[model samples]
Target: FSIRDIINGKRGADAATPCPTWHPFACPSGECVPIKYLCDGSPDCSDEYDENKSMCTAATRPPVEETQAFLKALMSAHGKDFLVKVFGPKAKAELSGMGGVDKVAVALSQTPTADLFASEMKLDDGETQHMLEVMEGILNGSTDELTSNEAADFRFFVQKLQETGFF
Candidate 1:
């Protein structure tokens, strides 16, 4: 059950009618409301309430070690060159939450080699600000504000990756 699935109203995490964790920041100001869960395990909200649990599957994924190693090496080889776009929330100005982390982790987890290339956006100042604003507008309530616990976890991930020589 990927986030897409929940947004599409698939089974399992998408099992609920009303979605949980449905914070939508896209609407005009003052219209934002905290999206709650409808209890069927599926997300009824358009934003995907069960996005957190949808992508992780023990069956499709190899052990976490492979992913860890892959990210480490990939970063070490190209991290400096890449613009280093880390997606998270404004509150997480320091670090991202489970959903953001999980998304990044999944991408890294699939990497077969740490020597993978880094893809950076070459936005000018105006473009960069525009992009940030666009992201902020879209991600308003989708992500939880980063907490100390999440930051700690993020630090751990970075430290471990660095220790492994990913960069």
Candidate 2:
């Protein structure tokens, strides 16, 4: 079930109390914690639930093809000019150096986290940060950070990625 459903207590007794706005990750112990706490190479849960091998593995692993498709769709959604405005000249150079939009897609697919994008791409401005944050939303199953239009675009891109068996 989605976190929203859990927050709304729709699952009855199984539902977790609402996680705080700044802390979205829910532990089975009925505790809420920040997303960064999950798979952060440390055990936040007393039972080490946050350190579950499978979950940690998944956290570090970027879905290469799915992320590529998502980036491609996102680029198409915003177009090159909009991209330049948010991502800056460095981004344009990376895109060009990598060969084109497809190559840039591959690059992003290789590292599909907002932190990675922000740090590696030197993204500092509001629009750029928001763009990466939107990508983070899609990557982490939390689209609440996205605007309505961006959410719609994310859904469409995800649908396309699913068609390719990437979901």
Candidate 3:
């Protein structure tokens, strides 16, 4: 299920109600448009919200230096092999590509959390369950179950989510 559904609680009879195309980014015009349409050199929102100078330019730009530091810490915590195993080839390429962590941060900034959870960064069933367990520990204030690096990574990721308004 999508994070929106999880956070908003179950829909009532209106769950089946039809709407515009399946997308996440909501416009001031009462429409939900694809994020790709947001800052794609055009104004998708009727109120020009998508192309707003401050929101589009500033809000979407990931904090390159901060993200880079976080990524470096993560790398030091879990060697490249482990990172590659969890994040896959795209992450490897992005991390090794020119500008490295900054580019990865930019790409991640643009991705919708639901999409990432559902596909791009999708975890296996077993891994998902383990992560759920870890989350439970965190919720109960018993994060000792997580390794130091794991806890650090979890906190950093969640912080980024809040910064990007994805959570």
* Better model by TM-score: candidate 1 vs candidate 2: 2
Model 3: per-residue Cα lDDT over 93-120, one tens digit each: 4356223666555545555453344244
Candidate 2 Cα deviation (angstroms), residue 41 = 6.4
**Better lDDT candidate (1, 2):** 2
List the candidates ranked by TM-score, beginning with the highest.
3, 2, 1
Highest-lDDT candidate? 2
Regions more than 4 Å wrong, model 2: 1-62, 82-94, 97-113, 125-151, 155-167
1-167: candidate 1 lDDT, tens digit per residue: 13654465333422233323454422222122343432345644455433333232321354566554544554454342221334323214211332232344564444322333122222245544543443333333222333343333344444444443333
Every model: Cα RMSD to truth? 17.9, 15.3, 15.3
Instruction: Report every candidate's CA lDDT.
Output: 0.37, 0.55, 0.53
**Full-model lDDT, candidate 2:** 0.55
Which residue pairs of candidate 2 clash?
Answer: none
Runs of candidate 1 exceeding 4 Å displacement: 1-62, 65-85, 88-106, 110-117, 120-147
